[PDB]
Amino acid sequence: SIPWNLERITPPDGGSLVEVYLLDTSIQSDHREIEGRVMVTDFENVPEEDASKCDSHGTHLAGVVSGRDAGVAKGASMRSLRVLNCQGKGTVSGTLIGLEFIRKSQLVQPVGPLVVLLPLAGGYSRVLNAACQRLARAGVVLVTAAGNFRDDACLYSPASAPEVITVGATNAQDQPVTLGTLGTNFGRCVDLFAPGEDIIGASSDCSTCFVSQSGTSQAAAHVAGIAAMMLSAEPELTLAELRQRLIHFSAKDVINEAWFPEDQRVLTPNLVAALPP
């Protein structure tokens, strides 16, 4: 049997030509699911708090992207930057310093196509959107979470940046994910949806432990994996061509738009990401 989400995106250990940068919490890089596939950079810029719990979020997402048993792009390599503290909180300034670190690292030692996964959100930020726009215009692909606020993604960053691929979350019924009284964001700033409910992935509680997690971070990690597979098969794709491929291979009109507020139905793309055949 296979996790529902991996079956959903399947219409080979792919994505080997791409490096995926992850800006998140600390990661248990020795977990059997991701050991040897995640390179922990010396980067750390986190605010003071208000090890197993500290690395929960990032370890799970690294597993979603490249994990041996439950990853999307099992051939992709990852590089992690710590911008979120033990409580999952970071700053816009720390995230800016991290994005700049990625660009500097690329200029010093260029490799293949880069995908940057931003599984975080804050309020609309002119500076964070501008830094994302500059990095995308430099040729780097950025994928971010739409946000878990059951709200218009245009009010959050980096979700609101048009040059970033912004991902909402859907469940096994292809419906928008509910997360307590909130749930996935929606609206015109969301590019597409992807599996983000009960996603089996690496658990930092033990070297071989697995846990199911839900959220737009998990949905964005699926899209970063799909992008790594698409770019590894067609490395010359521009960002515009990659976005066109993601839309082309997505499942269309399967989301029941009634879950979204009335005015957001026409503005929200009815697309669920999938791998090409």
Partner: protein
């Protein structure tokens, strides 16, 4: 010409730390000199400041820990495009 911006979600604001963003094409040498100029002008007015980081590569500018009382003065510095108060981001 420069403008000031702060997070609309008031509980997510981090007052006391500001991202000073300079105009496109401002060089690292100009960003470092502008940062020193702010520090000197602030010290003349009795305020302590700290330059936490100098940006270059994506956006030119710097990160400064200082009282928001200095924002009107900082917005008059040469090359300033805008200033944004730092704010929180959260794992999704």
């Amino acid at each position: 010409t420069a403008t000031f911006h702060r997070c609309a979600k008031d509980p997510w604001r981090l007052p006391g730390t500001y991202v000073v963003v300079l105009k496109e094409e401002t060089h690292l040498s100009q960003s470092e000199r502008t940062a020193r100029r702010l520090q000197a002008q602030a010290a003349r007015r009795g305020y302590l400041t700290k330059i936490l980081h100098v940006f270059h590569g994506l956006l030119p500018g710097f990160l400064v820990k200082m009282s928001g009382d200095l924002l009107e003065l900082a917005l008059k510095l040469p090359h300033v495009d805008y200033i944004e108060e730092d704010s929180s981001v959260f794992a999704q």
